Amino acid sequence: PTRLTKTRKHRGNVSAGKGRIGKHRKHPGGRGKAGGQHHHRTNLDKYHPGYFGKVGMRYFHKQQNHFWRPEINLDKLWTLVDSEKKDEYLSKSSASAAPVIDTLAHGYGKVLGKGRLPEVPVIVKARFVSKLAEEKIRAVGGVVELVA
Amino acid sequence: VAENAGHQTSAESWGTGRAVARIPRVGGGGTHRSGQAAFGNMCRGGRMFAPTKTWRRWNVKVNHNEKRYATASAIAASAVTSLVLARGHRVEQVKELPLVVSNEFESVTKTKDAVAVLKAVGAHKDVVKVIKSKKLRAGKGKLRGRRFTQRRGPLVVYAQDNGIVKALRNVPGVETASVKHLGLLQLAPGAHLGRFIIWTQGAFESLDSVYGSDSTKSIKSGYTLPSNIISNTDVTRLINSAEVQAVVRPAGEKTQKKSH
Amino acid sequence: AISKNLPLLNNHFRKHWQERVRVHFDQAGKKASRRQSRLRKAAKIAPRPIDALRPVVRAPTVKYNRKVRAGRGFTLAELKAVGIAPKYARTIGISVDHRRQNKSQETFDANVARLQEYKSKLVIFDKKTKASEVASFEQVDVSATFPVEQPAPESGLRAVEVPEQTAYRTLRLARNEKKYKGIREKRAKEKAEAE
Amino acid sequence: AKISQDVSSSRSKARKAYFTASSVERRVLLSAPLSKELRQQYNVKSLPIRQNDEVLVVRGSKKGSEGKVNSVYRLKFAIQVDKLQKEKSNGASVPINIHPSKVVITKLHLDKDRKALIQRKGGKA
RNA sequence: AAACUUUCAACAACGGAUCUCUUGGUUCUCGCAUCGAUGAAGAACGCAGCGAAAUGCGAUACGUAAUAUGAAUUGCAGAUAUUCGUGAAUCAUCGAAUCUUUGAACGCACAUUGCGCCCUCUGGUAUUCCGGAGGGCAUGCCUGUUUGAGCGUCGU
RNA sequence: UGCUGUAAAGCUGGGUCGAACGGCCUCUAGUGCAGAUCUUGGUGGUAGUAGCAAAUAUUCAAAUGAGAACUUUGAAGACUGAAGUGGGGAAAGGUUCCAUGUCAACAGCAGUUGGACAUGGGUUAGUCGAUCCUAAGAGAUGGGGAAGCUCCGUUUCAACGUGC
RNA sequence: GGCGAAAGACUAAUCGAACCAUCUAGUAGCUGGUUCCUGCCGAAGUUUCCCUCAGGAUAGCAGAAGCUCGUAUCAGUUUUAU
RNA sequence: GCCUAGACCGAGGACUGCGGUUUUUACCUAGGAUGUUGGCAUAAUGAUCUUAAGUCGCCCGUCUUGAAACACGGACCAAGGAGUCUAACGUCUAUGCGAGUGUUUGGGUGUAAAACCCGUACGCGUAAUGAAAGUGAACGAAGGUGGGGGCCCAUUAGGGUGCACCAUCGACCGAUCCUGAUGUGUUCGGAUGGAUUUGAGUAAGAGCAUAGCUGUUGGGACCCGAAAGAUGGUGAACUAUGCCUG
RNA sequence: GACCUCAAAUCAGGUAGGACUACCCGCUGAACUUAAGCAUAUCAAUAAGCGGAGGAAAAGAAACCAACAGGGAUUGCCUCAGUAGCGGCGAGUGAAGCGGCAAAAGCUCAAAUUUGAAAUCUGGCGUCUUUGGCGUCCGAGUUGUAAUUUGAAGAAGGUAUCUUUGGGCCCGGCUCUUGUCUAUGUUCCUUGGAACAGGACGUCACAGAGGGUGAGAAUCCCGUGCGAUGAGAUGACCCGGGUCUGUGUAAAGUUCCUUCGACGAGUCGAGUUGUUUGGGAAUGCAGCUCUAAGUGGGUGGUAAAUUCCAUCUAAAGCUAAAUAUUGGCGAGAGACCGAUAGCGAACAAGUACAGUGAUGGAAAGAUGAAAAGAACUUUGAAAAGAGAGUGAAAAAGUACGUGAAAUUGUUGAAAGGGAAGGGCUUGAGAUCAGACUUGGUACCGGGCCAG
Ligand SMILES: CN[C@@H]1[C@@H](O)[C@@H](O[C@@H]2[C@@H](O)[C@H](O[C@H]3O[C@H]([C@@H](C)O)[C@@H](O)[C@H](O)[C@H]3N)[C@@H](N)C[C@H]2N)OC[C@]1(C)O
Ligand SMILES: CN[C@@H]1[C@@H](O)[C@@H](O[C@@H]2[C@@H](O)[C@H](O[C@H]3O[C@H]([C@@H](C)O)[C@@H](O)[C@H](O)[C@H]3N)[C@@H](N)C[C@H]2N)OC[C@]1(C)O
Ligand SMILES: CN[C@@H]1[C@@H](O)[C@@H](O[C@@H]2[C@@H](O)[C@H](O[C@H]3O[C@H]([C@@H](C)O)[C@@H](O)[C@H](O)[C@H]3N)[C@@H](N)C[C@H]2N)OC[C@]1(C)O
Ligand SMILES: CN[C@@H]1[C@@H](O)[C@@H](O[C@@H]2[C@@H](O)[C@H](O[C@H]3O[C@H]([C@@H](C)O)[C@@H](O)[C@H](O)[C@H]3N)[C@@H](N)C[C@H]2N)OC[C@]1(C)O
Ligand SMILES: CN[C@@H]1[C@@H](O)[C@@H](O[C@@H]2[C@@H](O)[C@H](O[C@H]3O[C@H]([C@@H](C)O)[C@@H](O)[C@H](O)[C@H]3N)[C@@H](N)C[C@H]2N)OC[C@]1(C)O
Ligand SMILES: CN[C@@H]1[C@@H](O)[C@@H](O[C@@H]2[C@@H](O)[C@H](O[C@H]3O[C@H]([C@@H](C)O)[C@@H](O)[C@H](O)[C@H]3N)[C@@H](N)C[C@H]2N)OC[C@]1(C)O
Ligand SMILES: [NH3+]CCC[NH2+]CCCC[NH2+]CCC[NH3+]
């Protein structure tokens, strides 16, 4: 609200806080990103290195949907098990009856390997998997099943 | 304001050397308007500084959970007699708050009968407070469809509307609300807590379903009533308890004696 | 112009942007009027439903394979399998899509099932039908009565069966085979023809 | 409170409609209540005032005056009663303008049309 | 010491601030689709018992008919104007008319109240000269009618 | 008339006046002026001051009138001096013309006078003009350009008579 | 653009490019102004880069919000040694 | 050690302290003024306004190293008169929820632009890195060392546990350089081990949303101010030149 | 005597032009500005200029999107996304597919032998039950008017028995427009010119919105709220029932089998030029040159040849809704402005007035409840004054609500040797204030100034 601004406190003081010498003027220094290579180089080279120039190759008509692959780590993987049967699955799961985890149906593209699993067999369904993620899944007695 | 207000002239600055200020001036001749200043916010008939626009932000978003928090807090405040009295309601002659009245009041259809019920349950003094508070509004608001002002009366909350709403429309100050749709504008008018609320029995028994309890989920999906950060709000009893007083050093004087 | 450590911004306001500002002051008014239009349109044709029955289709794009949604209309093959002509289906609240094709079996079965459910629940009135039976029915919401249902993800319990080759190695080999397919089958020819 | 979207609570619109009212609309705007005697006689509460009616003044400095209406001066929103005059210093006399809402009709001027109007309102003629 | 000047106070001026208001403006929303050769929008000039404007109207001129309604209009005057009624007032309503000179503007022209021609009727002894009334005569294009042109061309 | 606050300011006595207005808790903004050769309006000093001095020039008496240097009549003295301060017109104005009444404003003194103000009256054509003719020129039409508003052509690449 | 026995003359008191409306609140590192009180803190005209030299960015100097702690080792100063 | 002359002040408001004298659970000069008397209340007394006297006091605003300036604006008065709103953002703060968070595009509902209700998506967060193909975060109690508030055990000291945060040596993921196992579409694969290299990474999540001040950028952008540039129109009643008729 | 081409008529009957501006479809087309200079760029495919519509317009039933487990006319919103990309790769700029939602609706020709029958159509005339029907006569038309088909197909021959049915009218409904009707105090007291104010006692209330009336009126009036009861109009293109003809060896649909299956050219496409686009060895558009084909053609966002694959089907056409709307017509509103504000205009405002013209363009709201707008006397030439009179008020007199300041007159008080004004201090004169207390019961006790 206007009653809380410093404009109200500057009333009666000549320069409105902008100085007598400098004198708030229209556009000293130019408009926008003007002078980025000339008189604003000391700002851009300090706070935005990399600004000027070209790196890498172009990609005409890039479709971002081709690259959709949300990641889930092993330390989070049991959140996908139904919450009402998680406690039971942790106790009763064996090599002959293990929980199935359909990661793609939960909206994930790749299973990554950060963290530690419960020492319980699981069946993990995924489009992609990292080398360590599968190795940790097989070490608790589980398996990764590739789906498309 | 209109986007072209103060800009419907072809005025140009005379420039310098004619002993007048450099503001643009109306051209032509033969009328007193000729030669007068134009366009400037300091000029009579110019356009205002920074003319108002329609794309100013008018509405404000509030998180739905926080809005529900405030609604719950306002409902809780209505059961505190000190808050209701401070809010200005004439609830001196009501035995207990919350005031719950039987469901026969949901089927009253005539205003006379509804006023009879309000008198019987001791809520008519607050209606009389509304009737005697009517005043002409101070200032130009009375030119803009807001000619009179008055106090707010009791809020009647029902579970079924079998005529209670229409029976109460014409009563000055009285507001009615379904127990299913309760909002802060009715619960804490002027942001002041402690609305005088008259519950029907049906609405009072519906509250626990609407907002939930320990035994009952809210019908609001995934909603739970907020928890306090303090469990016992009487800090004086906490401070003057046997647990605390067993570890405090003896107190000093309320005012230190002037020694020098 | 450029100053202290701040993100570089892209505010596109260098044209006469104020001449083209659309403020939806009428959001609530249009909601209410759109609601009144639905009411009048439904009252016009009661008890016939306002919405035609729609098929269930897979969404394209590897990002949206997993999902299934409502389509435009049933295919000519889907209607053929239920014994309904395309020009007749339009008169009984069934949408038709001559463009969609049925390359697989699953979507075809799901839509044939939807069509059979709708035909089982359909009652076509005629000149013999009396006003008392027409008054018996309530205007049913078709998209609510025949909702699009996502097939449930596999869950529960199953035996663990470990292949000797890892999933990761399977993926690496599949990538390698795809990548070098063209040059390996060029080598296969030029070695063969030289024989 | 008003409910109809065809009804307006704008003060400016109400005043403009009142001051620009035509003569025919002013006729109804210039209605007067009937006395309790004529109210229990004709079973009507109020009627538009007419030229040959008789009234009792019940408000203002002329309260208690009785007389027969001489004119319904619709342009001025007023009626002029027979012997209710103001005397000027030059000896001429001018009628005292009275609003119909400040009188009670004591005797009605009746013809076929007034009788028909009374019967339409649930009265008896 | 007066006069004079200066300061204040009272009253009176000058002037139109302040306060109070508001048939106006301004913004938002809701609903609707209807200008014109069947002559529009706009222009000029007129019209009332007493009017210069504004408002309305067109030589039927602050209006004619019709429908509704039911006693006014009013500044003054005044019915051969009216009241238990084919009846005061009424841009209330409005479906029938009137609608000057113009204007896309249409016989030609227009800085002219200039100049033709055709038809019917009518006045001056008149098919021709002079007068009056009514009705007509633009352009581009379409369909059709009729009257035609060309060794373009068929047949006899 | 006093009181309170360091202050921004708040409250109060007396007068004037005539229809609405304030405290407190909050919300919100087109929210506070000494200046910008600021804007609009209003008002001073200057100041009863500069000044109201080109075009020879006025005077006596009577009448009228409340009032006469300034109006009217008479007497006179003058001037324009026919290349006029005379008598008419074209362009332009538009009732200024005339009679009667009339002095608030206007006639930079005045006013009984007036091109002022008010109410009426007034412009008569076969022969005077316009109207008609063509002049430099302007410009429709079959047409040729141009996206088009339109441009070009007029002895105009045309089956062109409202013929006698 | 006109028109010029030529002066950059004239083209409606406008001419080394008329007038009118609009684009247009054209842009200005430049000149002017910038509206209440009290309280506490309180500068800089220096460094580097810039068609930079009446201007900016950058560091410095200044305010505000604090936060982690509570005498830890600090100082526009001396002594002793070097 | 003693005697003696003047001036200004009197803050505080039961008691509580330190001392002293002791003749005393007492008294004092010792943690800030009391006693007494006269006058007055029709007033001695205090404040303001006007004026005199004494003393000091240049005209404000502004640019400026420097203004009372022979620098600029200001004759006077009233009313108007200049950091705003918006899109997107940085820091900080308050609030709700929290590995999530955001009802308001839309639908439901309504006492009808409100209030109340609903969910699929979507945004942002939960993973990074590389130009890219791609690959993708625990040797260990999520490591060692030195500090570290608080807590625990003692009994100054001392011993233990030590979150946040800090210094330091490592470990993990991506990029780069090297090495090159079982194997092979024999040119692929990349086990394993190295490297004063490199990243806006890991190593028991902290974010999302609303609001507020300040700061930023685009916008008329604090207010007023060019000389100019463009588009479409209007003028030869003045005047320039030709022509026609006087 | 035809025909073809081309004319004329005040021939019979029609049609077009012009206006309006907010939104809509195109053409044409800047510069200021930003880049701290500036030319590409930007502003901007914007302003100005031109042509053309409607209630919406346009677009529209794929020569589409994709690369998936595939979607499925067009349009809009949210998101994609300030992203891919474009850019003196600077300043800047910048879409699409998917996903959620609003709304949903589909189709028509050309290319075919009716050939056992031009089955088609405008016009004239007559007639009727007239947005037209019937009868008849010219004319158009074979250089092609009907029926039949439109790629989703479909056609001609069979097929299996199935399945289906057009039209002319009356009354209702719905829709629109419109008439009539409606609760409760003007009770008592005080103030006031006026009660609509305050007090008392009440009433109605599905009505306590708003306005009027001599001051703040639910209850005085109009309305408000609630319903009730009639009149008319319109609707192939809305549906609910009834009435008479069904010319149904007919029209259509479904299934199976056989043979077929016409599908748009100076166009597609290519080069080049200019312009534009995010479109980058070239996104669309246009000019010129070249100029196709029939499993062909187009697209598949890096130019080329080779081989595959996917997906549609161009060069012809129509179409509601969701979308837009500073204009027109009808309404309702607001934390908006309150006469120097708000539109320029609250008023005889686009007025008065200026300019040759294009154009430019003001100022200006309020007596009082009611004119009761001051009779009469008197002084004056008169304007006016003085009495009187009306009014609640003339401290309201058409110079009219209140009536500030600058500036001015008069009255009173005071000061005044080449400015005035200010601070500090005291005197003098004027004003203000306080304790004999809210004093207590002759006494007690207090207040102030002093020794
Ligand atoms: C659309 N506006 C209407 C306006 O037209 C008018 O309505 C009148 C209404 O008052 C009349 O009705 C009135 O007058 C009649 C009678 C005396 O005329 C009375 O019987 C009746 O009670 C009364 N309400 C009615 N007869 C015609 C409407 N146009 O007044 C009311 C209104 C709401 O302002
Ligand atoms: C090849 N086509 C030509 C066509 O061009 C045209 O020719 C014209 C001819 O008619 C013109 O000539 C014509 O028109 C002019 C007129 C223009 O002034 C007349 O003076 C002249 O007499 C007349 N014959 C000649 N001056 C130019 C040719 N191209 O007409 C003749 C034509 C043979 O058909
Ligand atoms: C412990 N030191 C290691 C160092 O040894 C090295 O590890 C390499 C690793 O980079 C190689 O891995 C590398 O190359 C393979 C490629 C060959 O397929 C890529 O897939 C992979 O992404 C890439 N990081 C891996 N193939 C062997 C390790 N010793 O990686 C860097 C390091 C962390 O410093
Ligand atoms: C391959 N040789 C490695 C050498 O590179 C180094 O390892 C660095 C390590 O120091 C870096 O890690 C460094 O930087 C990270 C930072 C990025 O967050 C810090 O968290 C970390 O404390 C710091 N040590 C790590 N980011 C890459 C390794 N190769 O450590 C020594 C070594 C083993 O010789
Ligand atoms: C208790 N376990 C800790 C674990 O918490 C974690 O500690 C990190 C620590 O490594 C980080 O610190 C690290 O990263 C910073 C960074 C600025 O680059 C480096 O400067 C620093 O040298 C490096 N040690 C610190 N910033 C947060 C702790 N939680 O990693 C180290 C650890 C010992 O395993
Ligand atoms: C007869 N002369 C007229 C006269 O009617 C004049 O009216 C003003 C009038 O407007 C004033 O009245 C004013 O009232 C208020 C307030 C300022 O008083 C103003 O805000 C409002 O504009 C105006 N109505 C009034 N007080 C005096 C008359 N001479 O209006 C113009 C005029 C030509 O001078
Ligand atoms: N509105 C801008 C009009 C000018 N067009 C220029 C923008 C595109 C310029 N070409 C970009 C480079 C070519 N791909």
| Concatenated DSSP letters of C52-118 | PB--EEE--HHHHTT-EEE-S-B-HHHHHHHT--HHHHGGGTB-B-SS----SSHHHHHHHHHHHHH
Question: Which amino acid makes up residue C33?
Answer: S
Helix (H, G, I), strand (E, B) or coil at C20: helix
CA distance linking residue C136 with residue C118, whole number of Å: 19
Q: Which of C3, C14, C61, C155 to mutate: most A Cβ within 10 Å?
A: C155
Q: How many CB pairs under 8 A join B and D?
A: 7
Q: Is the CB of D59 under 7 A from strand I?
A: yes
Q: What is the dihedral of CA C95, C96, C99, C105, to 10 degrees?
A: 90
CA distance linking residue D37 with residue D105, whole number of Å: 10
Residues in contact with ligand 1 by the CB-under-6-Å rule are D 28, 48, 117, 121
Distance from C13 to chain B by nearest Cα, in Å? 15
CA distance linking residue C164 with residue C167, whole number of Å: 9
CA distance linking residue A50 with residue A41, whole number of Å: 12
Q: Which of C20, C22, C23, C26 to mutate: most B Cβ within 10 Å?
A: C23
B55 contacts on C by Cβ (under 8 Å): 21, 23
Q: Do chains C and D touch (3 or more CB pairs under 8 A)?
A: no
CA distance linking residue C63 with residue A68, whole number of Å: 6
Q: Is the CB of A6 under 7 A from strand F?
A: no
**Closest-approach residue (CA) in chain B for C19:** B3
Kindly provide the b/e burial profile for residues A68-86, where b requires at least 16 CB atoms within 10 angstroms of the residue's own CB. Answer: eeeebebeebbebbeeeee
Strand A110-112, strand A71-73: pairing: parallel
Tokens found for residue D28: 């109804």
**Backbone φ, ψ for residue B185 (5° rounding):** -65, -30
Residue C15: nearest ligand to its CA? 7
**Backbone φ, ψ for residue D84 (5° rounding):** -105, 100
Q: How far is the CA of C183 from the C1' of I313 (A)?
A: 36
Nearest CA to B224 out of B63, B61, B65, B62 is that of B65
Decide if B49 touches C, using CB distance below 8 A: no
Task: Report the residue among D4, D16, D28, D44 best suited for mutation to probe ligand 1: largest number of ligand atoms under 8 A from its CB.
Answer: D28
CA distance linking residue C70 with residue B177, whole number of Å: 40
CA distance linking residue B118 with residue B104, whole number of Å: 13
Nearest CA to C58 out of C69, C46, C47 is that of C69
Q: How far is the CA of C86 from the C1' of I65 (A)?
A: 25
CB atoms within 10 A of CB C148: 16
Radius of gyration of chain B (CA): 31
B169 contacts on D by Cβ (under 8 Å): 1
Question: Which amino acid makes up residue B149?
Answer: T
Q: Do chains A and B touch (3 or more CB pairs under 8 A)?
A: no
CA distance linking residue B163 with residue B166, whole number of Å: 6
Residue in this structure with the two tokens 């005025």, named with its chain if needed: B11
Question: Which amino acid makes up residue B221?
Answer: S
CA distance linking residue D58 with residue D80, whole number of Å: 15
The nucleotide minimizing the C1' distance to residue B52's CA is H85
CA distance linking residue C12 with residue C20, whole number of Å: 13
Please check whether residue B13 is in contact with residue B24, taking contact to mean a CB–CB distance below 8 angstroms. Answer: yes
Q: Quick one: DSSP state of residue A115?
A: S
Please check whether residue B28 is in contact with residue B12, taking contact to mean a CB–CB distance below 8 angstroms. Answer: no
Q: How far is the CA of C121 from the C1' of F128 (A)?
A: 107
* Three-state SS sequence of chain B: CCCCCCCCCCCEECCCCCCCCCCEECCCCCCCCCCCECCCCCCCCCCCCCCCCCCCCCCCCCCHHHHHHHHHHHHHHCCCHHHHHHCCCCCCCCCCCCEEECHHHHHCCCHHHHHHHHHHCCCHHHHHHHHHCCEECCCHHHHCCCCEECCCCCEEEECCCCCHHHHHCCCCCCEEEECCCCCHHHHCHHHCCCCCEEEEHHHHHHHHHHHCCCCCCCCCCCCCCCCCCCCCCCHHHHHCCHHHHCCCCCCCCCCCCCCC
| Burial class of residue A47 (count of CB atoms within 10 Å of its CB; 0-12, 13-18, 19+) | middle
Q: How far is the CA of B71 from the C1' of F53 (A)?
A: 96
Going by alpha carbons, the residue nearest to atom 7 of ligand 1 is: D25
Q: Do chains C and B touch (3 or more CB pairs under 8 A)?
A: yes
CA distance linking residue A77 with residue A102, whole number of Å: 10
CB atoms within 10 A of CB A122: 24
Question: Which amino acid makes up residue A11?
Answer: R
Tell me how many degrees the CA angle B249-B250-B255 measures, rounded to the nearest 5: 120
Strand A98-102, strand C157-158: pairing: antiparallel
The CA distances from residue A33 to A25, A44, C116, in Å, are: 18, 10, 65
The answer to whether the bond into B51 is cis (omega within 30° of 0) is no
CA distance linking residue B172 with residue B174, whole number of Å: 6
D11–B143 C-beta distance less than 8 A: yes
| Interface chains of chain A (3 or more CB pairs under 8 Å) | C
CA distance linking residue A76 with residue A82, whole number of Å: 13
CB atoms within 10 A of CB C189: 9
The nucleotide minimizing the C1' distance to residue C23's CA is E28
C2–A66 C-beta distance less than 8 A: no
Please check whether residue D66 is in contact with residue D106, taking contact to mean a CB–CB distance below 8 angstroms. Answer: yes
Tokens found for residue D57: 């003044």
Displacement of CA A80 from its chain's centroid (Å):
20
CA distance linking residue B202 with residue B114, whole number of Å: 17
Q: Is the CB of A24 under 7 A from strand H?
A: yes
Nearest CA to D33 out of D44, D23, D18, D42 is that of D44
CA distance linking residue B64 with residue D56, whole number of Å: 65
Decide if C64 touches A, using CB distance below 8 A: yes
Decide if A77 touches C, using CB distance below 8 A: no
Q: Quick one: DSSP state of residue A147?
A: -
The residues near D36 (Cβ < 8 Å, ≥ 6 apart) are none
Tokens found for residue D24: 């025919």
Q: How far is the CA of A35 from the C1' of E153 (A)?
A: 85
Nearest CA to B207 out of B186, B190, B230, B225 is that of B225
Tell me how many degrees the CA angle B217-B220-B222 measures, rounded to the nearest 5: 70
Please check whether residue A123 is in contact with residue A100, taking contact to mean a CB–CB distance below 8 angstroms. Answer: yes
Nearest CA to B186 out of B62, B66, B71 is that of B71
